[PDB]
Each structure stands twice: as C-alpha cells, then as structure tokens.
Amino acid sequence: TLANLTEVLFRLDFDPDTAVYHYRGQTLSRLQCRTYILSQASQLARLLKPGDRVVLALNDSPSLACLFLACIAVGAIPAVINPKSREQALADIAADCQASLVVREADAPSLSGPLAPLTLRAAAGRPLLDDFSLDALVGPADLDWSAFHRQDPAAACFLQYTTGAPKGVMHSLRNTLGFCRAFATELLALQAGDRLYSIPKMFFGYGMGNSLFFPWFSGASALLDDTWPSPERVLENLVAFRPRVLFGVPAIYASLRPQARELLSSVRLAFSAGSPLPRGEFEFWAAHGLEICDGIGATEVGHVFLANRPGQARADSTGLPLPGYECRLVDREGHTIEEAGRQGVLLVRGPGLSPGYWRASEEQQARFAGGWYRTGDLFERDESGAYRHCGRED
Numbered sequence: 003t004l005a006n007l008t009e010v011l012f013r014l015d016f017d018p019d020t021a022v023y024h025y026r027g028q029t030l031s032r033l034q035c036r037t038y039i040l041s042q043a044s045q046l047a048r049l050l051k052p053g054d055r056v057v058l059a060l061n062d063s064p065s066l067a068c069l070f071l072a073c074i075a076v077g078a079i080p081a082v083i084n085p086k087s088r089e090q091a092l093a094d095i096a097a098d099c100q101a102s103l104v105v106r107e108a109d110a111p112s113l114s115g116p117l118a119p120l121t122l123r124a125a126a127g128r129p130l131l132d133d134f135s136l137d138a139l140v141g142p143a144d145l146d147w148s149a150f151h152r153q154d155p156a157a158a159c160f161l162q163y164t165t166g167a168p169k170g171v172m173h174s175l176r177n178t179l180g181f182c183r184a185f186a187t188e189l190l191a192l193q194a195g196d197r198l199y200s201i202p203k204m205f206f207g208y209g210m211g212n213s214l215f216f217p218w219f220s221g222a223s224a225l226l227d228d229t230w231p232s233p234e235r236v237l238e239n240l241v242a243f244r245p246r247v248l249f250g251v252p253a254i255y256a257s258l259r260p261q262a263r264e265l266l267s268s269v270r271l272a273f274s275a276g277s278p279l280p281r282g283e284f285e286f287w288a289a290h291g292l293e294i295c296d297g298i299g300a301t302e303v304g305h306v307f308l309a310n311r312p313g314q315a316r317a318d319s320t321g322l323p324l325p326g327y328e329c330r331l332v333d334r335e336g337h338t339i340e341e342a343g344r345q346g347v348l349l350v351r352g353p354g355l356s357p358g359y360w361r362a363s364e365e366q367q368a369r370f371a372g373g374w375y376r377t378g379d380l381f382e383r384d385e386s387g388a389y390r391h392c393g394r395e396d
C-alpha cells in the first residue's frame with residue numbers, strides 16, 4: 003500500500019497532548035508539531051514537486067525536525083548535515099543528491115556552482131518555530147492541509163550522508179520503521195512519556211533516530227540543543243531536563259565521570275554507540291549503579307543493529323543482534339566463520355537495512371551485495387553468541 007512516513011507517524015496511537023520535543027526551556031506537544039508540520043507542508047508543496055531533494059544545514063532544533071518531516075510530508079527527500087560544514091563539503095553533498103533546496107543558518111552564504119540549489123535561511127533569534135522565510139517566498143500556509151504524497155514503502159524518502167566523495171544512503175518508510183521497531187521497541191522498550199537526551203546531533207544517523215524519530219515512534223520526548231555539546235553544556239542540560247534515557251558515546255561517558263551523581267539522579271538507561279565502550283568505562287559506571295549499554299549501528303543499516311540488552315550488558319562486548327537482524331562473520335576468502343574466538347568481517351541484514359546509495363558506482367554499491375551490508379568492521383563471536391569489535395578490514 004502506498005504510504006507516507008510522516009503520515010504514518012502522525013497516526014500512531016499516542017496522546018497528542020504529550021511532549022514530543024524540548025528546546026530552550028520550552029516544550030512542544032505532538033499536536034503542536036503536527037499542526038505546524040502540516041502548515042509548513044502546505045508551503046513546501048508550493049515550492050517542491052514530489053521527489054525533490056533538500057539539504058538542511060541546521061543546528062538541532064524543533065524547526066529542523068519538523069521541517070524534515072514537512073519535506074517528507076509533500077514527498078520531498080531530505081538530508082540533515084552538519085550546519086558548520088565547510089562550503090565545499092556542503093556543495094559536494096548538494097551536488098550528489100541534486101538538491102533543489104538548501105536550508106541554512108542565519109547569515110550563511112548562498113550556494114553556487116552548476117545547478118546550485120535555492121538557499122533559504124533560518125530566522126535570527128532561535129525561535130521555537132521557524133518559517134525559514136517561507137511566509138515571504140510562497141505566502142502564508144493553508145489552514146487544514148493533508149495532501150500527503152504517498153509512495154511505495156520501499157522507495158527512498160530521506161537520505162543520510164555519513165572523507166571521500168560523499169555518498170547518500172537511501173532510507174525508506176519500510177526500513178525506517180524497521181530500525182525504530184527493533185531498537186526503540188524491542189531492545190529499549192521505550193515508554194510513552196520517557197524523556198530522551200541524545201548528545202550526538204541529528205546530522206549523525208545515531209542522533210536522527212534518537213532525537214527525531216523515537217519521540218514520534220514511541221510517544222517519548224527528546225531534548226534538542228542547537229549549541230555544541232561541551233561537558234559544561236551537557237551537564238546544565240542534564241540538570242534542567244533530567245532525562246530518563248541518555249544516548250552517548252564512550253568519550254562522553256568518560257567526560258561525565260566527575261558528574262556521576264547528577265547523571266544518576268535521572269538517567270536509568272545509558273546507551274553508548276559510535277565506538278567500542280572500554281571495559282574501564284563500563285565498570286566505573288557499574289560501580290555507581292549505572293549500566294552502560296554498548297551497541298553498534300551504521301548509516302547503511304538505519305540505527306543500532308547489534309547491542310547489549312538492558313539489564314544483561316557485559317563489559318568489552320557489543321552484545322547480540324537485535325531482533326530481526328542477522329549477523330555473519332566472513333573470513334578473508336568470503337567463507338562464513340562458525341567458530342567462536344575467530345575474527346572476520348561483520349555482515350548484517352534485517353529491518354533497518356538501506357536499499358542502497360542514492361548515487362554510486364557499482365563498486366560502491368557492492369557494499370550491499372547479496373542482501374547484506376559489509377560493515378568493514380572485524381568482529382569475533384564468543385560461546386554465548388555475543389560479538390566483540392576487533393578492528394577494521396584491510
């Protein structure tokens with residue numbers, strides 16, 4: 003059945019009066035955001051035809067997340083990238099996906115070059131909701147817009163760009179719901195009302211799931227912060243927001259050690275991704291009564307696909323494949339490794355798997371060969387089935 007991801011999220015059975023995003027000491031409800039998204043969608047539909055690409059070079063904010071979903075609502079294909087990207091990096095990405103539109107921070111330069119996109123800027127003053135000058139460009143919004151562009155659930159509806167010539171990972175309605183269900187429901191069992199805080203930003207796939215999607219998907223809420231996460235800023239946000247679920251990385255947990263007491267006041271579920279969690283970090287927080295759950299995700303797989311399960315986490319370990327995912331280890335001749343304590347390259351398939359790169363040579367697309375994503379990570383398995391990272395392929 004033809005569907006639209008934003009519409010599907012809006013139909014999930016959660017109280018429309020509960021928080022969905024927090025920003026600068028303010029709170030926006032699901033109903034407030036839906037109302038704004040549809041209004042903004044009414045304007046974007048005047049500017050973009052179905053399928054047109056859009057690059058958002060913005061700091062984390064409710065307007066970013068909503069604008070992202072408004073693009074999808076009208077059938078556009080958005081991508082969220084570092085707002086402090088070098089000018090050439092932003093052009094290389096916008097060229098790769100042939101963007102029609104780029105939305106940037108206030109005072110940002112215009113994009114140039116062959117077929118350069120239209121550049122619109124956010125408003126100064128960091129308002130809770132931003133029209134990104136759409137009011138002046140296409141006029142005010144419709145009042146009761148609902149003209150969702152519905153497409154095959156397997157089709158691309160947004161992109162994720164992770165040193166080389168940039169590549170765009172396609173994500174579809176189907177595999178996006180796939181990686182949310184596996185991680186937010188089956189692994190973490192997030193609850194309605196759960197206050198989430200992801201330190202990695204939404205231009206990182208990890209952060210896009212944590213902050214953008216999971217609030218809608220599970221009825222939870224996420225703190226959004228448009229300033230860079232220094233330990234000083236992270237702690238103040240911890241004290242003001244008191245999240246129940248923290249999404250961090252190993253160095254973040256290392257830097258939070260001198261503030262263990264403040265974190266323990268609210269955080270009941272601590273997650274780490276991006277790189278291996280050292281045993282030393284796992285045990286320091288265990289001594290303070292905090293379990294840190296290490297899991298691996300990759301842009302090409304949507305989110306975390308192999309992780310320590312809450313309440314059963316172990317030091318120096320990446321845990322188990324999430325439900326629905328299958329993991330395989332291959333030796334240097336492409337043969338599947340069955341033994342434990344024998345390292346090989348990790349391949350994965352499952353609900354979160356991307357259908358491919360937006361624009362790529364056949365060699366690049368070969369990373370998805372055979373229905374598996376080749377992580378390029380060396381892994382070994384132990385007798386319990388749990389995986390441990392062993393380096394990179396060569």
Ligand SMILES: Nc1cccc(F)c1C(=O)OP(=O)(O)OC[C@H]1O[C@@H](n2cnc3c(N)ncnc32)[C@H](O)[C@@H]1O
Pocket residue numbers: 164206207208209274275276277278279296297298299300301302304305306320377378379391
């Ligand atoms: N997109 C994401 C969504 C959710 C969570 C994420 F981590 C990402 C992400 O890290 O995505 P990414 O930029 O594509 O990097 C993917 C690459 O990071 C490395 N890695 C990620 N977690 C790791 C871990 N816990 N232990 C060891 N190595 C790890 C590895 O080498 C992998 O292949």
